[PDB]
């Protein structure tokens, strides 16, 4: 009857006595150090909102590093290690371009989603440290997807990722309904980000984009954001 030491969390291919992958769990915990992102899917579009978290006034805020365009109808969002998403973004772009060139029609979001998932499930010898929020519209309609460092995608309707995700998810649960409007979705995203963020809300601390069946992928500019902020 003695107490001894045992370790099961130093390998990516090791099972604990209760059947857990502690390296993957730690990789998932690693995305709690990133900035907060919010994505809401409506009947006429998807809105993606992130915060920039400018550490120093000398840093140039005009840089775009959190929202990326995959194609004319697909957006993206990121949280965690931004340097880890470059390969996934490149593969998604290559796959969608090749499919469009070959078939002469745009692929659905699910196809590029599965193509991305087929690359993340190769542990590079370690799991990724980033979380994605794919958004877009297709013949079926607007739809939203979420990914974890585990390498698998799921479909959702209102998801928040980042450090302050629990309160944002609680607010999204106590707000929101099935038949709503894109403008009020954008507004509610602004309010929720305003409570979540520690500092005040300006035209440069955040950036958001949207995709709708009418136009192509569109990213809001400073002039457009100011009217929405003033609308609050």
């Amino acid at each position: 009857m003695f107490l001894t030491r045992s370790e099961y969390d130093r390998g990516v291919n090791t099972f604990s006595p209760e059947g857990r992958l502690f390296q993957v769990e730690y990789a998932i915990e690693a995305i709690k150090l990133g900035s907060t992102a919010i994505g809401i899917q409506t009947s006429e579009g998807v809105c993606l909102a992130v915060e920039k978290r400018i550490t120093s006034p000398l840093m140039e805020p005009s840089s775009i590093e959190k929202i990326v365009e995959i194609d004319a109808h697909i957006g993206c969002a990121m949280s965690g290690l931004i340097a880890d998403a470059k390969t996934l973004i490149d593969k998604a772009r290559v796959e969608t371009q090749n499919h469009w060139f070959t078939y002469n029609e745009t692929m659905t979001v699910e196809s590029v989603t599965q193509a991305v998932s087929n690359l993340a499930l190769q542990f590079m010898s370690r799991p990724f440290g980033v979380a994605l929020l794919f958004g877009g519209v297709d013949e079926k309609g607007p739809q939203l997807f979420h990914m974890d460092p585990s390498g698998t995608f799921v479909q959702c309707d209102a998801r928040a990722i980042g450090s302050a995700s629990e309160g944002a998810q609680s607010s999204l649960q106590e707000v929101y309904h099935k038949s709503m409007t894109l403008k009020e979705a954008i507004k509610s995203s602004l309010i929720i980000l305003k409570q979540v963020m520690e500092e005040k809300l300006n035209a440069t601390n955040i950036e958001l984009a949207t995709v709708q069946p009418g136009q192509n992928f569109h990213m809001f500019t400073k002039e457009e954001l100011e009217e929405v902020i003033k609308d609050i």
Binding site: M1, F2, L3, T4, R5
Partner: protein, 248 residues
């Protein structure tokens, strides 16, 4: 410090001290269990510190249905006044930066209560052996210069072999607090003897069964060899639970 189980501390007027060291394979702890179980010692107090990880459990030495429900902790003291023997058992592992204060406190208690000598059972790593040691006996001993001459003469008669020195300093890899205890005893003029064995981790019951006989060659607390030791009731499931079905 020593906290008595009752109201007054017993008179340990220079009996002996038998203690283990938390080393590779837990050989010292297993040997201590064997000795305590065989001699049928009785608990007399506690050694309460803040250097070991806490743990609790029921009585590890149970023979009847009335003594099997006694709570135990990670540091306890057993005594046999007839033979003038005292035993200490450690059932846990040390916290970081907490070994030297523990050794200092233990040696201060040993000096304060008043004991003839201290005997430590330990072990060392087996893969750090040179060519000459690979073909020799795996048992070694060590004595403080303050030790009595009669003990030295007896050990010389026993034809034992002493631990080798390295450039000169004493090094015992995988020995835990053995080197610290030896150095402090040398610096504080305390009679202490150390016995160890080269082992590897795995099933280490035979190593303890050999170490107890090695000690008995000198102390002779039992009839000389020409079973003898009582296995405690807590040595039941040393590999885990049972076999799941639908596999073999």
């Amino acid at each position: 410090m020593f906290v008595p189980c009752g109201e007054s501390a017993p008179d340990l007027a220079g009996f002996t001290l038998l203690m283990p060291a938390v080393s590779v394979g837990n050989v010292g702890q297993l040997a201590m269990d064997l000795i305590i179980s065989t001699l049928n010692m009785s608990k007399i107090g506690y050694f309460y510190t803040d250097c070991l990880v806490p743990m609790v459990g029921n009585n590890p030495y149970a023979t009847t249905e009335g003594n099997s429900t006694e709570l135990s902790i990670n540091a306890e003291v057993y005594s046999l006044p007839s033979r003038k023997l005292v035993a200490l058992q450690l059932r846990s592992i040390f916290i970081k930066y907490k070994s030297k204060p523990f050794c200092e406190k233990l040696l201060s208690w040993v000096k304060s209560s008043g004991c003839a000598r201290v005997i430590v059972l330990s072990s060392s790593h087996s893969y750090q052996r040179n060519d000459l040691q690979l073909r020799s006996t795996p048992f070694r001993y060590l004595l403080t210069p303050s030790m009595q001459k009669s003990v030295q003469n007896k050990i010389k008669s026993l034809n034992w072999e002493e631990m080798e020195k390295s450039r000169f300093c004493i090094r015992i890899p995988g020995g835990g607090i053995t080197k610290t205890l030896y150095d402090e005893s040398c610096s504080k003029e305390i009679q202490m003897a150390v016995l160890l064995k080269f082992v590897s981790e795995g099933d280490n019951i035979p190593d303890a069964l050999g170490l107890v006989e090695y000690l008995n060659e000198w102390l002779q607390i039992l009839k000389p060899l020409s079973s003898r030791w009582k296995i405690p009731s807590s040595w039941r499931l040393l590999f885990g639970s049972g076999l799941p079905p639908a596999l073999f």
